[PDB]
């Protein structure tokens, strides 16, 4: 809420590159919760892969969702209707890997 439907934080923070991006809260099945700063229109696949890849998980075994909403590879927070600090849960796609 700035005037209408925006957050008025960009004119304070933004020391990284282009002001600031948006961070999601990833909930892993190991209860690991990681904060990812992706751009509004960033492939949430990348988000999914970052978690899985570094933590040693196969992408076919894990699904990332926004409040139970299945994230697709070419789907981004912008498209799904999320913003900074939104939450994404990890659930099992197929058999464990």
């Amino acid at each position: 809420m700035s005037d209408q439907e925006a957050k008025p934080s960009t004119e304070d923070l933004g020391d990284k590159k282009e002001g600031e991006y948006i961070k999601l809260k990833v909930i892993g099945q190991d209860s690991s919760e990681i904060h990812f700063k992706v751009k509004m229109t960033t492939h949430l696949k990348k988000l999914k892969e970052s978690y899985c890849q570094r933590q040693g998980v196969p992408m076919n075994s894990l699904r990332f969702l926004f409040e139970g909403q299945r994230i697709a590879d070419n789907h981004t927070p912008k498209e799904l209707g999320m913003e900074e600090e939104d939450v994404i849960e990890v659930y099992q796609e197929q058999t464990g890997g």
Binding site: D30, S31, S50
Partner: peptide
Amino acid sequence: KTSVATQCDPEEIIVLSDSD
């Protein structure tokens, strides 16, 4: 007067580089 205490940290995953 305040002192810092070390915390225990679980899984730390890194983030990728931004799109858009």
